[PDB]
Amino acid sequence: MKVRASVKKLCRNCKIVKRDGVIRVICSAEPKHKQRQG
Amino acid sequence: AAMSGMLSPELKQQIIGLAEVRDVFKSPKFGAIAGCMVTEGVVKRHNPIRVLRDNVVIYEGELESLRRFKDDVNEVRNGMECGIGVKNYNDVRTGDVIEVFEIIEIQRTIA
Amino acid sequence: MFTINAEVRKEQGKGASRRLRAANKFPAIIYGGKEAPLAIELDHDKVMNMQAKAEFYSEVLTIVVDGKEIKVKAQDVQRHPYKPKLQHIDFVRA
Amino acid sequence: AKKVQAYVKLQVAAGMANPSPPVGPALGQQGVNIMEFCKAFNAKTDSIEKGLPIPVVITVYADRSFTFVTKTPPAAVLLKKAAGIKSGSGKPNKDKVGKISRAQLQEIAQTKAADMTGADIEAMTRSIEGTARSMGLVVED
Amino acid sequence: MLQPKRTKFRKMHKGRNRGLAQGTDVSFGSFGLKAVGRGRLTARQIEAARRAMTRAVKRQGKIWIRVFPDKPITEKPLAVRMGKGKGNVEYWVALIQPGKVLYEMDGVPEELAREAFKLAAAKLPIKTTFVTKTVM
Amino acid sequence: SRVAKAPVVVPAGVDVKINGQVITIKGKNGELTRTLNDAVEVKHADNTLTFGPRDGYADGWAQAGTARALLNSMVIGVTEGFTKKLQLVGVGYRAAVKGNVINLSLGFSHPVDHQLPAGITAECPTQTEIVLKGADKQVIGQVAADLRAYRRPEPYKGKGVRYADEVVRTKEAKKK
RNA sequence: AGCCAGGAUGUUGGCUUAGAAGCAGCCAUCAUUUAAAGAAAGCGUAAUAGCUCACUGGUCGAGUCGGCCUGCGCGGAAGAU
């Protein structure tokens, strides 16, 4: 998964969630859309 | 494998540094020394250069002598006063910019 | 048609005017004809919603102050530099 | 209009004899004989005249060869012989290109044996006109 | 790149970016981009944002440039002692205050106006916001 | 909020005994006893159970929706019982059961023996199929994840352990 | 927002076309039947596709959607005894 300061919803199948003290991007459709440290 | 090696491709012509020349000086050996100020990157000795004026290239060549003061250093960084001269270049005019670029080879594979 | 609630301003100068902006209000003036200039305070959030329509700056406005309906028209509006906000508006008796 | 499992339509023209380079084995992989395509197509279609290209459904599961019945051609193929120019697209919107009248492609559109959308005759008149004006023609109707 | 064709003088002092802006609204076009933050905009910065808005819209409508550098800014090169005159002008900048409209646009939808100015806004150093043509 | 507002219903034979925050649910197939968070208040009345918040808590309604969903899954768990069907795929993948332990061979150098905790019972009707069954929605999910944890499918072919409702989307092998 | 369905006709859309029947290409982006369905949304085929989506019916039955102003916080945030 990519990791970078800004995170954005790429496709409609992506979803923004909040785990611990870090924002993440969960995308079931495309695993390339996974992101950290949002 | 023998075939793949045979290939000689260099896919990079990225600029090493870009510099603008001002206040030309006269030299006996090269015929001219163009005072320069590097705005970006690092200027090197044996790396080829592209001399252009008003976005079109007036002249082309490879540096023979890179000399600042009497030091004659082989490398000059950006925003440091620099000096330049080359053979077979007759006319030095202010406002033009010289683009130096390194040459690298990507290499090739067969398929 | 446009009803705006208003009140007479007690104090004047920038000192009072800057205090009104922190309290979600802003200064104003009504002039024209034989009647003298009157200092007016208006609500920020109420006037901001009304001015969004194009009919605010064209049609005649009826300001209510101290139980008195005075008909005026909008002349000039000083908007805030960058934020979508207001500073002061000039009204004309008509 | 039934289900999946072998329902396909492709051709080059009705007048052709099914040669190899235009279609040949590139029609697909079925199991139905390509020689027998020149038997039941050449029972009905060749009987009078073969002007325009015609597609068709397969409908085969367990038994030997194709059991289908042929249907009508498209409306695009009617824009060449009985209308005007064959292709001449070029730049469709830079100029008027060509043209079709109200009487043209009226009696030709109703030559379809048995297939339509809706019972109204006035509805189907301008339904088949839909394939026209796709190439940037003018409407004089 | 935007720069003066001629000037009365070669160089200018540092000055300051104190005080507020003048042009609160878009006079020429319909929609535009306002400067929220306080700073300066170079010739390359002004050039870069103009390309991105034009690249998104392709070829339609019109773009007005309300700003312009006007101010020669010098720099001193490396391995040089302090003083010994003033440096040479590497680039031109504009003093931007809060309230300045930077760019404008007309003859397009409001949806694409947000997209073009958002891409242009990212190239800018200072914070910016969308603005609409207010009547009167 | 929207979940917790709905009353959950207990069928005939289901005894619900509430000593405190702990809730014992029993029925036909097994017996479970969870512990609530303490933020939620549960009320037993008639043939149903109802949930809601309590004063002096920030979370409030959001915890009541879980407390319903945990106790609702227990009602289906004790009476009906959940099922998790995990099929093996590919060459040299066989599954069997010997008592409480499941013996699985996922093409490894040694056989993998997985112990089933609690009262979870399983059976293999087909060699490539495994059918898990249990009265807890917590344990049947967790135990099913442990079987898939040994062999996670690579999506070039789709071999290995997968769930029945899961879909494995494969891709091409690129080019030389 | 879930769930049970439909997902079309001109039309396999003419086409500088080997092949195109929506897709990097071509162009307009018009036009029938219909509760509603685009010459158009896609993981993506040797071409049919297999499938799902915009849009719409039934089910369920009361709030729901995301811009604006603003307080205090979150990631961005890795240095050597």
Curated annotation (Swiss-Prot), chain A:
One of its GO terms (cellular component) is cytoplasm. The keyword ATP-binding does not apply. InterPro entries: Ribosomal_bL36, Ribosomal_bL36_sp. Disulfide bonds: none annotated. It comes from the Bacteria. NCBIfam families: rpmJ_bact. One of the last ribosomal proteins to be assembled in the 50S subunit, it contacts a number of helices in the 23S rRNA, acting as molecular glue. The simultaneous presence of uL16 and bL36 probably triggers ObgE's GTPase activity and eventual dissociation from the mature 50S ribosomal subunit. Part of the 50S ribosomal subunit. This is Large ribosomal subunit protein bL36A. It comes from Escherichia coli (strain K12). The lineage of its organism: Bacteria, Pseudomonadati, Pseudomonadota, Gammaproteobacteria, Enterobacterales.
From Swiss-Prot, chain B:
Belongs to the TRAFAC class translation factor GTPase superfamily. Classic translation factor GTPase family. IF-2 subfamily. Component of the 30S ribosomal translation pre-initiation complex which assembles on the 30S ribosome in the order IF-2 and IF-3, IF-1 and N-formylmethionyl-tRNA(fMet); mRNA recruitment can occur at any time during PIC assembly. One of the essential components for the initiation of protein synthesis. May protect N-formylmethionyl-tRNA(fMet) from spontaneous hydrolysis. Promotes N-formylmethionyl-tRNA(fMet) binding to the 30S pre-initiation complex (PIC). Also involved in the hydrolysis of GTP during the formation of the 70S ribosomal complex. Upon addition of the 50S ribosomal subunit, IF-1, IF-2 and IF-3 are released leaving the mature 70S translation initiation complex. Induction: Part of the metY operon that extends to pnp. It is found in: Cytoplasm. Signal peptide: none annotated. It comes from Escherichia coli (strain K12). The modification N6-acetyllysine is found at residue 29. The gene is infB. This is Translation initiation factor IF-2. Disruption phenotype: Essential, it cannot be deleted. The C-terminal region (residues 165-890) is sufficient for growth at 42 degrees Celsius, although it grows more slowly at 37 degrees and is cold-sensitive at 30 degrees Celsius. The lineage of its organism: Bacteria, Pseudomonadati, Pseudomonadota, Gammaproteobacteria, Enterobacterales. The chain holds residues 780 to 890 of 890 of the full protein. It comes from the Bacteria.
Swiss-Prot record, chain C:
It comes from the Bacteria. InterPro entries: Rbsml_bL25/Gln-tRNA_synth_N, Ribosomal_bL25/Gln-tRNA_synth, Ribosomal_bL25_short, Ribosomal_L25_dom, Ribosomal_uL5_bac-type. This is one of the proteins that binds to the 5S RNA in the ribosome where it forms part of the central protuberance. Binds to the 5S rRNA independently of L5 and L18. Not required for binding of the 5S rRNA/L5/L18 subcomplex to 23S rRNA. GO terms for cellular component: cytoplasm; cytosol; cytosolic large ribosomal subunit. Gene3D superfamilies: Ribosomal Protein L25, Chain P. CDD domains: Ribosomal_L25_TL5_CTC. It holds the Pfam family Ribosomal_L25p. It comes from Escherichia coli (strain K12). This is Large ribosomal subunit protein bL25. The gene is rplY. The keyword Isomerase does not apply. Belongs to the bacterial ribosomal protein bL25 family. Keywords: Ribonucleoprotein, Ribosomal protein, RNA-binding, rRNA-binding. Part of the 50S ribosomal subunit; part of the 5S rRNA/L5/L18/L25 subcomplex. Contacts the 5S rRNA. One of its GO terms (biological process) is cytoplasmic translation.
Curated annotation (Swiss-Prot), chain F:
The modification N6-acetyllysine is found at residue 43. Transmembrane segments: none annotated. It comes from the Bacteria. GO terms for molecular function: large ribosomal subunit rRNA binding; structural constituent of ribosome. One of its GO terms (cellular component) is cytosol. PROSITE patterns: RIBOSOMAL_L6_1. SUPFAM superfamilies: Ribosomal protein L6. One of its GO terms (biological process) is response to antibiotic. Keywords: Acetylation, Antibiotic resistance, Ribonucleoprotein, Ribosomal protein, RNA-binding, rRNA-binding. This protein binds directly to at least 2 domains of the 23S ribosomal RNA, thus is important in its secondary structure. It is located near the subunit interface in the base of the L7/L12 stalk, and near the tRNA binding site of the peptidyltransferase center. Belongs to the universal ribosomal protein uL6 family. NCBIfam families: L6_bact (TIGR03654). Part of the 50S ribosomal subunit. This is Large ribosomal subunit protein uL6. The lineage of its organism: Bacteria, Pseudomonadati, Pseudomonadota, Gammaproteobacteria, Enterobacterales. The gene is rplF.
